[PDB]
Design a protein around this motif. Structure first.
Motif, PDB file in Angstrom:
ATOM      1  N   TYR A  11      87.704  41.741  41.564  1.00 10.77           N
ATOM      2  CA  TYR A  11      86.743  40.771  42.070  1.00 10.77           C
ATOM      3  C   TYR A  11      85.531  40.608  41.164  1.00 10.77           C
ATOM      4  O   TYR A  11      84.607  39.870  41.518  1.00 10.77           O
ATOM      5  N   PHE A  14      81.003  41.761  42.090  1.00 10.38           N
ATOM      6  CA  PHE A  14      80.452  41.583  43.429  1.00 10.38           C
ATOM      7  C   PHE A  14      79.670  42.816  43.869  1.00 10.38           C
ATOM      8  O   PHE A  14      78.541  42.703  44.367  1.00 10.38           O
ATOM      9  N   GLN A  17      76.469  43.133  41.732  1.00  9.22           N
ATOM     10  CA  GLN A  17      75.432  42.210  42.189  1.00  9.22           C
ATOM     11  C   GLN A  17      74.812  42.674  43.501  1.00  9.22           C
ATOM     12  O   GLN A  17      73.596  42.549  43.696  1.00  9.22           O
TER      13      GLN A  17
ATOM     14  N   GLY B   7      87.993  32.111  45.084  1.00 12.60           N
ATOM     15  CA  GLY B   7      87.152  33.093  44.414  1.00 12.60           C
ATOM     16  C   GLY B   7      85.998  32.475  43.642  1.00 12.60           C
ATOM     17  O   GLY B   7      84.862  32.951  43.721  1.00 12.60           O
ATOM     18  N   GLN B  10      83.490  31.083  46.107  1.00 16.38           N
ATOM     19  CA  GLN B  10      82.671  32.173  46.628  1.00 16.38           C
ATOM     20  C   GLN B  10      81.629  32.621  45.609  1.00 16.38           C
ATOM     21  O   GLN B  10      80.477  32.885  45.971  1.00 16.38           O
ATOM     22  N   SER B  11      82.015  32.698  44.330  1.00 16.21           N
ATOM     23  CA  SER B  11      81.072  33.062  43.274  1.00 16.21           C
ATOM     24  C   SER B  11      79.985  32.007  43.102  1.00 16.21           C
ATOM     25  O   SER B  11      78.804  32.344  42.952  1.00 16.21           O
ATOM     26  N   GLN B  18      71.780  32.722  46.071  1.00 15.69           N
ATOM     27  CA  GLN B  18      70.797  33.568  45.404  1.00 15.69           C
ATOM     28  C   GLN B  18      69.769  32.740  44.647  1.00 15.69           C
ATOM     29  O   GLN B  18      68.594  33.115  44.604  1.00 15.69           O
ATOM     30  N   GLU B  25      61.315  32.131  46.534  1.00 16.71           N
ATOM     31  CA  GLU B  25      60.321  33.043  45.965  1.00 16.71           C
ATOM     32  C   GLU B  25      59.475  32.358  44.892  1.00 16.71           C
ATOM     33  O   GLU B  25      58.253  32.546  44.841  1.00 16.71           O
TER      34      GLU B  25
END
Lengths: 50, 50
Positions: A11, A14, A17, B7, B10-11, B18, B25
């Motif tokens: 993966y 992950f 991170q 995948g 998801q990344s 993030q 921020e």
């Protein structure tokens, strides 16, 4: 488990991170408590007279 | 290819989420910089340790 540890490397980063985010969080509460409480340089003491 | 699509989606979703938290921020720091140019540069702040 060895098999799940081998499959977890497929993966990518992950877990790396996640660990980086949690380490930044844990450094951030130290920075929070330092910027709240440690604004004073030298520690002073109350005299016995009140 | 559906496994790779899920995948990489998801990344990319992790990257966008993030970047959204980091942009929140950065937006807080930019609001602080706007306040610290309106009050410090464009004025004189009477706030202690500001």
């Amino acid at each position: 488990s060895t098999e799940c540890s081998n499959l977890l490397l497929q993966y990518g980063s992950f877990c790396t991170q996640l660990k980086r985010a949690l380490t930044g969080i844990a450094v951030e509460q130290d920075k929070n408590t330092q910027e709240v409480f440690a604004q004073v340089k030298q520690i002073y003491k109350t005299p016995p007279i009140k | 290819i559906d496994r790779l699509i899920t995948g990489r989606l998801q990344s990319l979703q992790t990257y966008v989420t993030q970047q959204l938290i980091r942009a929140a921020e950065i937006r807080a720091s930019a609001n602080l910089a706007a306040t610290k140019m309106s009050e410090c540069v464009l004025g004189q702040s009477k706030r202690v340790d500001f």
